[PDB]
Design an enzyme around this catalytic site. Structure first.
Site, short mmCIF file in Angstrom:
data_model
loop_
_atom_site.label_atom_id
_atom_site.label_comp_id
_atom_site.label_asym_id
_atom_site.label_seq_id
_atom_site.Cartn_x
_atom_site.Cartn_y
_atom_site.Cartn_z
N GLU A 52 41.72 34.51 35.58
CA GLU A 52 41.95 34.06 36.93
C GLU A 52 41.85 32.43 37.16
O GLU A 52 40.91 32.03 37.24
CB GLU A 52 41.02 34.66 38.07
CG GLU A 52 41.33 34.05 39.37
CD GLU A 52 40.51 35.10 40.53
OE1 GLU A 52 39.68 36.01 39.94
OE2 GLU A 52 40.67 34.96 41.53
N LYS A 76 45.72 36.56 37.10
CA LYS A 76 45.48 36.62 38.49
C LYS A 76 45.48 35.32 39.14
O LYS A 76 44.60 34.56 39.32
CB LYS A 76 43.99 36.97 38.87
CG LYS A 76 43.67 36.94 40.66
CD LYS A 76 42.63 37.84 40.70
CE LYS A 76 42.49 37.78 42.46
NZ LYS A 76 41.45 38.82 42.93
#
Lengths: 362, 350, 350, 352
Positions: D187, D229
């Site tokens: 992420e 992400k």
């Protein structure tokens, strides 16, 4: 490409002043930060129980030697436990060290961990909450820190990954230390394990150190406020070819001249398995090398300073004087060596010539 | 990693010896490698036709100055054309230079080229067939070379790409030179253009040099057999804040100390458009700065050594003597400067 | 970082359109850019003098085959010499190529050179003056270029330096081509020489391609305006262990899926010494691999398309029809192969 | 230049199967891993005391929603505390999650820390003892993890150091996870704060993702056994220029196509402060973009899934059903969007 000052002029002055005091002419470092797991084997060698009291007593034995070591010791590295212990007179050890003109250091790394996809290579952990720990250690008396990374010479090592990762993490550790008024000692150790020769160790050492200082630059590290703890350049422990002390000294100083910027305050060599005498003779030859050296070249020995004392002690309280005497002898010797004025003589115990090498267990 | 010796002990000795000779105590370099195009404006300033003959005469004028310059000049950089010309008496220019105790240098780059996707930044070309050219130049009298990379301080420059590409091309150029017995002078010039202050120049210089030496290491360059030609650390030309020569000296020496390995044989500063007197005073302060310097700190000047001489000459052959006298005076001045003996008449803050 | 658009929307559309036309469904590339010194052995194999006229005749032989090859050939790479030669009817070869629906390509590199300090590794030269050259080639009919970098699998190779340097030079070459409306075909060939196995080739191939695309990113390369020419993933030429075509296809497609961004318009595989039939069967298996492939997977073959034609010709003008017939045979075979329609008659283990 | 297999075929198959199940067609991720300090703000917005029992009740409200969410939720990320709590009937929450067809996730990073010498930039800590923590979480029911790095667009940011350091730490985190059978979700969030436009965000996102995947390659990361992400590509919050959802989708898919290898199993977007309806409309537009997308493009929302539910609950037990209904509605809406079948009713690429 814009500057965002990590440190202020005052912060720089404090870091630089500390680094210089640790490696002042004739001075070196005593590495007594062995953990319980490590010191255990040490105490066992002399048939002594590995209790907190015994560890305390042993550390007290080294830290309370006569004032002859004062001009010899610029810094003393301690383990977390020892930083909060006291001598028989109630004086905290950090206070005992300072009263003898020494700076107090503390180990902050949390050991090595395996690097997946490599051939037995590792990186070091310990960054989590390091800032808060440094701030607290500073308050409790520490002024510098210790962090060790480990690399090995083999057919495929050290690998591109291992070199880059270990160099990056050292930089992070150094950055956090400087933000809390602590001088970081950058330690990228290249093990002596293997049968490679002198020139191979020199080649690897050169590549490793070039990577280390590029990383320190990328992370905005203040070099004047740091120290370097590298391995001397020597042939592999199993190397068949023999070399002289002058050759080891020339290879070592050459590798450093080609990679370490003059701004670095000092270099504190690690003995890495060398005997007490061998460690002093080489350090001396290095300081006598004809080449120009813009940084202090001294010591930061653990067993290379304690071997004889540990044997002379034997765990017997009535052998305190005998034990401390051996420690003092090695400190004076290395003090002279870091000045290029050492010439081994008569009374040099057999325990001082014993190889302190141990194959890396992994 | 595994070592595959790029150089033999003999080859290293040769490069190291040449490097030390160029920057011997009290000696510097005369940069007279201007091309027909880059020399045009200058001959124009004194109303002189830009012809090979006039160029030959001007170069002859500088290379044949009296023996007073011998202990001042350790090296002389020439342009391709000049390397093959002769003086009136028939002696090849390289021979004239050597007879006076100087080492002959040659420019080998082929100019800068724009980097697509950047704010007007560039890299330098000249690698194609460079090996054959160095071997030919070596045979014809040259012992060291010149290659210039150019960077600029701006809002978004120098970018990560420009720093990385220029440092990498400098390493390739150095590698090829050392394979042919030619000492490579690494020149990563950071222009003084702009209104930035002194501390900003120092910061950029530190980052650039750091990138340069990491690239030299990756390409297995033999540092003892090289020289560095950087810009001094100064404020931009349009900076409104004023600094003393001592501050310029401290910022310069501090930047070098933090990035240049002790193994580098020497540092030959570029004048970057400074006046003859200014470039001398600054080099003097640099050599008097308290900090320890593990490498020789000298000069490699162009206009900073020719300005007054070109003017006194004005193309008039009758002005030969007067013109040479000016050049001799700047050579003597800088020789004292690189020793910290010239006079016209808190380091933690860095 | 800050953006400084290297290309305009119009320049991008031109490059993307060219790239797509070359690798349109069922189409591949004919690599006929062999130099005089490279085609020399090809001609002596058939006892034919290596003259300009004989080389012109052979190229004409291939370029003027009947319309059956049109649907199979999206592009043709030529060597400088051939780009300026004409067929018997006076038509310039670039015109002959375009008239058959193909795009013209030009070889622009200047060969490999040794990298000092390595175990026989190399990099490639040819950047000097490349901009002006591309602008000229564009005017003369070329729309894409060829540049080959060479890497080798060995005990200590390819090294970190070879991978980084070769990746970087390919990015410089790509940047210059795109500034001039020329689609660059990035070619980082890993030789099959050696006794290594399939898994080792896949590992090295994966590491090299990751370095290549990080480099193209740093240099702001427009991927949609490029093509990739890699080696297939196969065991070393002297590998003791043997593998099937399905295995080669799985190792190749998996390696590409882990490193080549979907933005890349197409992949034109090099034959690398494979026989004519072998090269076609492997390409066919690659296209039948049961994994998602976001880019066109076609061919860019030299000898794997000319071997039979060259032999049939034998240097005798009376065998023109016979020779071209062999060429058409391989063109049709590979056109079916890049679609998975050719018939000669547990991916977690990767 | 030599290989030393970090993973065996069996270990690769396990990581790959887990990754595919999480982003299976029509499914997304519910991010309910808020910490005590983070959850404090949420509860305070509805006048509810921040006690463990209140947190447990709220998490239960979402985890025990009716079977309509089953085909919508492929994975649920939890905070440490929640992983060890139980529903009223006594069933462990991870057991509840699995029985409904979802995979259990756990947050393992330890927050951001300032990077000295930068203009307010940071990196993320949490590698210490991570291997032991992952082995323990695996045993206790977790199959994938969450680690968040934060970068910001500014006058001189993200800087070279920030990009390089954040990309490297993410790779270390990914390596340790895979060694313990845990699928890591990489992420690298680029904050939407600022007055920059669409083009600038796309540029920065492209340079960040390029560094991230080069780092994963250097650390020998198994891409098929990972998920990404990222932030959607949008103009800054203070940007005066306006853009359509189609332009946001095009810039987002273009940036991904130029940097994310097709080997990556899936992309789970963060809402980055967008409204519940906004995040659904954009995710839908991203899926309808007329470009080839070799990876699943779904969601991993927090407030974009809990916003209305939390308000409908208000901290009153009598509002459970009304609160759960709000959650189910967003779960169903996003299930359709990650398929490009979303509708309000409920049934030039060269310029980039």
């Amino acid at each position: 490409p814009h500057s965002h000052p990590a440190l202020t002029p005052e912060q720089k002055k404090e870091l630089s002043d500390i680094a210089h005091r640790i490696v002042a002419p004739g001075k070196g470092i005593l590495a007594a930060n062995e953990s319980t797991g490590s010191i255990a084997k040490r105490l066992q060698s002399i048939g002594t129980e590995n209790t907190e009291e015994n560890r305390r007593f042993y550390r007290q034995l080294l830290l309370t030697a006569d004032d002859r070591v004062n001009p010899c010791i610029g810094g003393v590295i301690l383990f977390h436990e020892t930083l909060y212990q006291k001598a028989d007179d109630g004086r905290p050890f950090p206070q005992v060290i300072k009263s003898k003109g020494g700076v107090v250091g503390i180990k902050v790394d949390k050991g090595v961990v395996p690097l997946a996809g490599t051939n037995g290579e590792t990186t070091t952990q310990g960054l989590d909450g390091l800032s808060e720990r440094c701030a607290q250690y500073k308050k409790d008396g520490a002024d510098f820190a210790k962090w060790r990374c480990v690399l090995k010479i083999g057919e495929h090592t050290p690998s591109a990954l291992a070199i880059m990762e270990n160099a990056n993490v050292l930089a992070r550790y150094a950055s956090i230390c400087q933000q809390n008024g602590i001088v970081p000692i950058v330690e990228p150790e290249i093990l002596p394990d293997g049968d490679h020769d002198l020139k191979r160790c020199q080649y690897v050492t050169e590549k490793v150190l070039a990577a280390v200082y590029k990383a320190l630059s990328d992370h905005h590290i203040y070099l004047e406020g740091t120290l370097l703890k590298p391995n001397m350049v020597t042939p592999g422990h199993a190397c068949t070819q023999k070399y002289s002390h002058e050759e080891i000294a020339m290879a070592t100083v050459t590798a450093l001249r080609r990679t370490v910027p003059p701004a670095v305050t000092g270099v504190t060599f690690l003995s890495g398995g060398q005997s007490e005498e061998e460690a002093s003779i080489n350090l001396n030859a290095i300081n006598k090398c004809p080449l120009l050296k813009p940084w202090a070249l001294t010591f930061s020995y653990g067993r290379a300073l304690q071997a004889s004392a540990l044997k002379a002690w034997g765990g017997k309280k009535e052998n305190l004087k005998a034990a401390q005497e051996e420690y003092v002898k090695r400190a004076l010797a290395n003090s002279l060596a870091c000045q290029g004025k050492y010439t081994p003589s008569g009374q040099a115990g057999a325990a001082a010539s014993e190889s302190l090498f141990i194959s890396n267990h992994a």
